[PDB]
Design a protein around this ligand. Sequence first.
Ligand SMILES: [Cl-]
Ligand SMILES: [Cl-]
Ligand SMILES: [Cl-]
Ligand SMILES: [Mg+2]
Ligand SMILES: [Mg+2]
Ligand SMILES: [Mg+2]
Ligand SMILES: [Mg+2]
Ligand SMILES: [Mg+2]
Ligand SMILES: [Mg+2]
Ligand SMILES: [Mg+2]
Ligand SMILES: [Mg+2]
Ligand SMILES: [Mg+2]
Ligand SMILES: [Mg+2]
Ligand SMILES: [Mg+2]
Ligand SMILES: [Mg+2]
Ligand SMILES: [Mg+2]
Ligand SMILES: [Mg+2]
Ligand SMILES: [Mg+2]
Ligand SMILES: [Mg+2]
Ligand SMILES: [Mg+2]
Ligand SMILES: [Mg+2]
Ligand code: NA
Ligand code: NA
Ligand code: NA
Ligand code: NA
Ligand code: NA
Ligand code: NA
Ligand code: NA
Ligand code: NA
Ligand code: NA
Ligand code: NA
Ligand code: NA
Ligand code: NA
Ligand code: NA
Ligand code: NA
Ligand code: NA
Ligand code: NA
Ligand code: NA
Ligand code: NA
Ligand code: NA
Ligand code: NA
Ligand code: NA
Lengths: 246, 119, 115, 145
Amino acid sequence: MQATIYDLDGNTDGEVDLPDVFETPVRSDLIGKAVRAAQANRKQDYGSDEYAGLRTPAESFGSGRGQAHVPKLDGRARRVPQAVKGRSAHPPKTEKDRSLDLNDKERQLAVRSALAATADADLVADRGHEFDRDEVPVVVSDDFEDLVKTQEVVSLLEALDVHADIDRADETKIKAGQGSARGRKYRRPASILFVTSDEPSTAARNLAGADVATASEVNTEDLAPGGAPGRLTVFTESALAEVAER
Amino acid sequence: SKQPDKQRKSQRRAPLHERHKQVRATLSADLREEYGQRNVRVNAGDTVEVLRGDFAGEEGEVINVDLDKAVIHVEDVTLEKTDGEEVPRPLDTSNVRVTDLDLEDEKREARLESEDDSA
Amino acid sequence: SKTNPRLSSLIADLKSAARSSGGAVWGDVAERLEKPRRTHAEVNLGRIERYAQEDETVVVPGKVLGSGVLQKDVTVAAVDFSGTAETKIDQVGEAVSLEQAIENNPEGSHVRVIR
Amino acid sequence: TSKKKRQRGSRTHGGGSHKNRRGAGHRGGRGDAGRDKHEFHNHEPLGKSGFKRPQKVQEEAATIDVREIDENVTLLAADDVAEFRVDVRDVVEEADDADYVKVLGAGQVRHELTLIADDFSEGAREKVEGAGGSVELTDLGEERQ
RNA sequence: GCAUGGCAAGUCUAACCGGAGUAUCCGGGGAGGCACAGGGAAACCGACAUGGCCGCAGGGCUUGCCCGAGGGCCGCCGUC
RNA sequence: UAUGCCAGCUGGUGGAUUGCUCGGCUCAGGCGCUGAUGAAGGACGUGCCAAGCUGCGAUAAGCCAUGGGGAGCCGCACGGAGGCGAAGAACCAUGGAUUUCCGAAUGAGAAUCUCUAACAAUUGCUUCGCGCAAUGAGGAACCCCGAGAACUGAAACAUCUCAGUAUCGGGAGGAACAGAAAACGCAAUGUGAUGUCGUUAGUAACCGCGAGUGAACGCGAUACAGCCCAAACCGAAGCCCUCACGGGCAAUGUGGUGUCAGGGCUACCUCUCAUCAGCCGACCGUCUCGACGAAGUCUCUUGGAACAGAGCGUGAUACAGGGUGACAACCCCGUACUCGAGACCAGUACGACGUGCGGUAGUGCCAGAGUAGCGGGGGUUGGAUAUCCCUCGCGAAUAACGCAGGCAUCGACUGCGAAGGCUAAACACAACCUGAGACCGAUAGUGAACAAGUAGUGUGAACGAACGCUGCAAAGUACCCUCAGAAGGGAGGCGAAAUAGAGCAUGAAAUCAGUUGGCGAUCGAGCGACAGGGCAUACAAGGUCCCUCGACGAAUGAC
Ligand SMILES: [Cl-]
Ligand SMILES: [Cl-]
Ligand SMILES: [Cl-]
Ligand SMILES: [Mg+2]
Ligand SMILES: [Mg+2]
Ligand SMILES: [Mg+2]
Ligand SMILES: [Mg+2]
Ligand SMILES: [Mg+2]
Ligand SMILES: [Mg+2]
Ligand SMILES: [Mg+2]
Ligand SMILES: [Mg+2]
Ligand SMILES: [Mg+2]
Ligand SMILES: [Mg+2]
Ligand SMILES: [Mg+2]
Ligand SMILES: [Mg+2]
Ligand SMILES: [Mg+2]
Ligand SMILES: [Mg+2]
Ligand SMILES: [Mg+2]
Ligand SMILES: [Mg+2]
Ligand SMILES: [Mg+2]
Ligand SMILES: [Mg+2]
Ligand code: NA
Ligand code: NA
Ligand code: NA
Ligand code: NA
Ligand code: NA
Ligand code: NA
Ligand code: NA
Ligand code: NA
Ligand code: NA
Ligand code: NA
Ligand code: NA
Ligand code: NA
Ligand code: NA
Ligand code: NA
Ligand code: NA
Ligand code: NA
Ligand code: NA
Ligand code: NA
Ligand code: NA
Ligand code: NA
Ligand code: NA
């Protein structure tokens, strides 16, 4: 199919052929599986002290004093799971493998399929992104990689009738629950993904909900955050081309 | 440290000299223009205007600056004790704005003017 | 509890065609596909070659693999073909998607089932 | 919902009398204990059987059946065509860590083939000749006497 | 064992290497494992890409009659 | 209707719940030795007032220098009094001063004190004099060398297993150990020091051949690095102390050469770029720390307080995180970007100085003995005839020789030279620094968020808790009455709130006081379920229900 390239003013400037991968049939299940793996693989191993609650010579008196056979020390019950200060029966364990494997084939396939999801205006609208455009993804001249001010990327977007999505991601959510106490107080909608070719868009990265990525290593997470296909993306003339062989 | 516990910790256990930065206040438009800084370490000489408390709006001369508790006493911003005495109602520099500076310190004025350092 | 939305849809289509059209093979294939993956068909060329016959579409309720040789000029319709199978088949005949078979022949006529 | 997930409130978690799930006694002993007494059922019998020749006195023949060669003669475009002629050593995988290559006679031979290997079986020769073919024995193959 | 999913006469990488958005992730790495032939203590030898019959589903026809994968019963082959 | 039962209401008791996190737990990166120049640890001191903690050490919460930092300060600790600071204090960094007693504890003795110069003790050198030096002890574990169980498994139990584990003795470092083949043995026209990681493989091997036990070569990676003596041939050409003088060592050999690309010697060829000794000496990277660092504190409403709602506007190489009287990119710290400093890498790489590599022919000159090897008895290992080691006895050759290649002997072939020595890097741990988190969130998580190894127990070894939350701000309740009263109570004052008033957020249940509804001093006990009556009931969140008659009318069905 055709891809309408845009200049930094937002005006049409020719058009290239939309590579084949964007025709890969959208497989949300595989995409989901690839996002799950990526998210699990970055989780850190944890677990309670191996000797927590065992640091005691407590012993049970046995029968004879009308007391349950519970190891005690200085008249205080100890060690056993049902005892306050006793060990945790089946606690979390450092040894546990919290990683998920995934076949390179299955994973690359999901990358392709996520890509394709990007080229369907309807999907991208369902995923929830806000925009008033008919073509998608949004392809732009490699000159974009030269921008430096965020403000300039804004204008470009407003001209491309896509800024409405950043308006969407311009709202932080203060989470329910104690994540808060661990430094996860906030969270925000995901907005536009900018895929360039030489380096990630320094000028676009700070944009609300935006994520910047490069064609050679852009992945399923960026392409489909939370495993949900159809993220409002903007490729670079060159990027678009590179992506084709992924 | 992106972790809340550490953030708060470091702020509460910061050595004396590192507390100065905790008693900083925004500078009036005129002054920001004049010294090329957005704020300054409020001193017991400056004049300042209350921007947020129950005293928001009032102005006065900074009477005291406590580095341990990171708070300042502004003249006339007080509380009525039971016995009738009048005592200062501590203020957080963050709800305050400096409108006049006491530059009796060569050093302070130096820093203020230089463009490579802030006071 | 199938996971593939595609496989899932394919099956819905196979039915709608077996119900509407007078097809009975489509409804037969649907039932096998609904069964566990392990029971699905995994057929190599060597077998198709052995029992197929021209002008009679060969229907594999599963996937076709590339071991063996195919000479007959037959039309094969599976859920999927390995890359080698589809390449080896298009050389002497035609490898077709079941979704195409259902459209070109909803009556499920002149078809031979192979597993 | 999984089975484990439905266990809360069942008390016995599927073990029957709460008296069952205790220690190894409920297993008739630790590991293969009693493989000769109470649990002899379905255990290969006790005993020594045969001998083994020292590992480095063993030869491992890399084998392949005519059917494979023959089924992909055309596809082996990168291999001699003549009045086909193929050196098996170059076809068989694992033909390096192998003490020698041997062709076996399983399947058919639908082409005239000139095969070069370190060894063949009767079946292999017969079939290859019967299809107007020939079998050439390698210099290594020169170990027949 | 099972259910789901990828690839398929194949399939998967391990440690590790490079890149990077630097514990994720993109690329590389097939060492090696399992599968592709078995039988025999060993020496050693080395198999049906289908020959016959029933017959489910499905298909065909001129509506009982053919074709009948899978399945079932034999043949036959390798080896001890 | 007393005693009393059930439920509720007000107040209490209690401290669950929800919310919060100054603490944990876990992972990750960096870094890593201290001590007779007396450590670590302990004791006792040290403040204006000072009990605990911290710091410090008779110069005692400290003295000096340099740099940074800055108008404030006098630790936790917010009192009273007093004081210090522009003579630039506080505070931070580095360096320096001081640094009681016990303590390896070292003059001798001793429960932290005492008695009349002291390396006690054992050593090395030695001016044979404690003159010069060494050792001692500590440290989270990691590491290396020795000693070495049992419960348990085998459904008993003895070999076997637990396990070379627990524990014990000795010792090093920042990493240890290992290491340049008398190797391997995909047997080869092959590989080429050593660790480690992945695999080889639960393979081979062991084993009441039960249960169980269990490698290696190789391969792929990480990191790479290779050398020095002994002797032959020289024979004092040498080394140590001292400024020097001078002394000591050394023919029982200092020093030269040389070390399987064998060497030496004799005659030659050519040459050095090997090696070894010494000089110089980083970049980058990484860890930590620091400097600078954009944009609203505008309108209206609610509110005690805007960080809320509506409106208007801004920054962004910065929309990580935190603070601030409620949800804050733009109020404050910071964050992106740029820059600087220290540490490590590393006395390494690179560079350079000196040395001289190598080759031919001749020469039976040299090449590590209780060794190789055999036997008796044990331990150990997968090691089986074929693991490694200990002990008792026996015991060889000399490169023209010797050892190995998983039974012995002889021959062949292939590998390779033991009985001397050293050796960077890649790997372990986590004390120390920093970072992180689908971990816990005050009966959890460390025993320990609090005086925590604290209070407290035990003669002792040892054992060992509980206790977090006023408020935006102390505005922490003046004045009056009462009282034996700085108690308590009343009245009153502050605050949005005091039912936020001090172990003070919220404030469950068990339960207590008072009280409302129902029952109640002639009556029977799983305390209820389903039916149906009495009595009782603010609103809200449920709105139905009753009778006449009439319509419909299953099974059943009359007087
Ligand atoms: Cl098949
Ligand atoms: Cl064997
Ligand atoms: Cl080798
Ligand atoms: Mg506990
Ligand atoms: Mg909650
Ligand atoms: Mg300035
Ligand atoms: Mg129960
Ligand atoms: Mg291979
Ligand atoms: Mg002493
Ligand atoms: Mg026993
Ligand atoms: Mg036993
Ligand atoms: Mg080691
Ligand atoms: Mg037994
Ligand atoms: Mg063992
Ligand atoms: Mg080996
Ligand atoms: Mg020498
Ligand atoms: Mg043993
Ligand atoms: Mg606790
Ligand atoms: Mg006692
Ligand atoms: Mg309360
Ligand atoms: Mg009565
Ligand atoms: Na303890
Ligand atoms: Na009791
Ligand atoms: Na793990
Ligand atoms: Na069961
Ligand atoms: Na049980
Ligand atoms: Na058993
Ligand atoms: Na028996
Ligand atoms: Na391979
Ligand atoms: Na360190
Ligand atoms: Na004190
Ligand atoms: Na000191
Ligand atoms: Na000494
Ligand atoms: Na002496
Ligand atoms: Na037993
Ligand atoms: Na017994
Ligand atoms: Na045994
Ligand atoms: Na090999
Ligand atoms: Na503020
Ligand atoms: Na012996
Ligand atoms: Na050998
Ligand atoms: Na508590």
